[PDB]
Amino acid sequence: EIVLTQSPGTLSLSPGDRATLSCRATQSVGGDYFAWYQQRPGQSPRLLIYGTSRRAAGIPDRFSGSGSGTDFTLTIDRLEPEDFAVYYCRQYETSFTFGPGTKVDIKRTVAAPSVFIFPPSDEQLKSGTASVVCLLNNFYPREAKVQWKVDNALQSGNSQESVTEQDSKDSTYSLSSTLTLSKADYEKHKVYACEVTHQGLSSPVTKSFNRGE
Amino acid sequence: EVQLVESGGGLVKPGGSLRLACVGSEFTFSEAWMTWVRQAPGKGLEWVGHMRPTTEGGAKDYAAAVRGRFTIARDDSKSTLYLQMNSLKIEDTGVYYCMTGVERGDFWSDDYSQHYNTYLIDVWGKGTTVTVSSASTKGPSVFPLAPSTAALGCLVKDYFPEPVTVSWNSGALTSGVHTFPAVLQSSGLYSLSSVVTVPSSSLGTQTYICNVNHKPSNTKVDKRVEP
């Protein structure tokens, strides 16, 4: 039952930087039974290093594996564009799990999000449900906080969030928050506000609408 | 080229059964140590179980979460690895991969030499999708996300199963488009949002249609998003 852990979850670096990825085991894993994998969205995993330090055929020599016992390290000399992906360690001696994975994304300049709010459509309303959508568009870093306030009352438990993968064009993320209510609850209130805090925002940004208009 | 192909994935109800197959090629199948790995939507790789080479006794192993429900089998004569999945649960949903590490021969020659070599090839199949849900197939209702840089979009709500396709203006509009990953609602139905940013000057000039395609239900919806 050896458990593997990876630090950190997200490693933000610039193309050309040197990356150092950690994997730790609760008990020692023999050197011939440790491996590093790479996975990009929509694709199968790819072996990079096996037996702790052996590069797989066809893998560029900028990838390098090291470590012993319970401490293991994957090094990428210079991050190429195709290297921004998820990396998994793996053991295969007496336990056979993968590590939780480390995501390497592109360290970009800070970008505040563009915030938009969308009322429920009239078509959806006459079906008995109301979903109000808040869009945080093209921001960096990935950390963002959306809070719904209905007539100045903080909501909780009635919204779901979705975040895109890091954009392949400008290296930003985007986020949609959907607050879902019934017709009855929606027609009861007037001010629907989406309050956003992000590292690129000096103060919280609110986008709101009034149900009538 | 050594390869692996998975098949058998599909939509099944909780407590139902499913058998996955994995066909290998270009390696001595009887000597291969076979492994099943799975990946839930947006989650990491999870080891499911393996079966040692037949030539080593063929011992099997399983993850605690699937032990007693899943069985791994092997047919060397047909180069096929199997995964019998019983008592399926919703947390079994995901992509399932077949994987092994195999030996390959490398040969080169000089005016003065002949060199033979073996190296490892770690191979994975492209995966097969297992969806365990009690929901019924249903196309989405598409609601406009009306504007008034401007932002507009379409809300693709209450569909099952994955996936759904969204284009804007029949693919003519691709810059500024963000189609978010779906979220699974408490109803067991998926909901998704697709947005696009455009110049505010275009809101009265250009018309915007989101073209939504849900093949499992034979649903095509073209929704015009107006101010």
Numbering used by the authors:
A (entry chain L): 1 to 27, 27A, 28 to 94, 96 to 213
B (entry chain H): 1 to 52, 52A, 52B, 52C, 53 to 82, 82A, 82B, 82C, ...
Paper text:
Here, we describe the structural characterization of an apex-targeting antibody lineage and autologous clade A viral Env from a donor in the Protocol C cohort. We previously characterized the V2-apex PCT64 bnAb lineage from an elite neutralizer in the International AIDS Vaccine Initiative (IAVI) Protocol C (PC) cohort (Landais et al., 2016, Landais et al., 2017). In this study, we combined negative stain and cryoelectron microscopy (cryo-EM) single-particle approaches with X-ray crystallographic studies of early and late autologous Env-antibody complexes to decipher molecular details of the co-evolution of HIV Env and the immune system response over the course of several years of chronic infection. Comparison of Ab-Env complexes at early and late time points reveals that, within the antibody lineage, the CDRH3 loop rigidifies, the bnAb angle of approach steepens, and surface charges are mutated to accommodate glycan changes.
Guided by neutralization data of autologous antibodies (Landais et al., 2017), we selected a late time point PCT64 Ab to make an autologous complex matching our late Env with a late antibody. This antibody was isolated from the month 35 sample, PCT64-35S (late Fab), and neutralized late M18 virus at an IC50 of 9 μg/mL. We solved crystal structures of both the early and late Fabs at 1.6 Å and 2.4 Å, respectively. Here, a sulfotyrosine was observed at position 100F of the late Fab CDRH3. Whereas it is difficult to directly compare the Fab structure with that of PGT145 due to the difference in the CDRH3 angle, alignment of the CDRH3 hairpin alone demonstrates that the sulfated tyrosine at 100F in the late Fab overlaps with the sulfate at Tyr100I of the PGT145 Fab (McLellan et al., 2011). The overall structure of the late Fab was similar to the early Fab, apart from CDRH3, which at the early time point adopts a β-hairpin at the base but is “splayed” at the tip, resulting in a very different paratope. Ala92 and Arg93 are replaced by Glu92 and Thr93 in the late Fab, creating a negatively charged patch (patch a). In addition, the nearby Asn31 of CDRL1 is mutated to glutamic acid, adding to local negative charge on the surface of the late Fab. In the late Fab, sialic acids of the complex-type N130 glycan would create electrostatically unfavorable interactions with the negatively charged surface of the Fab.
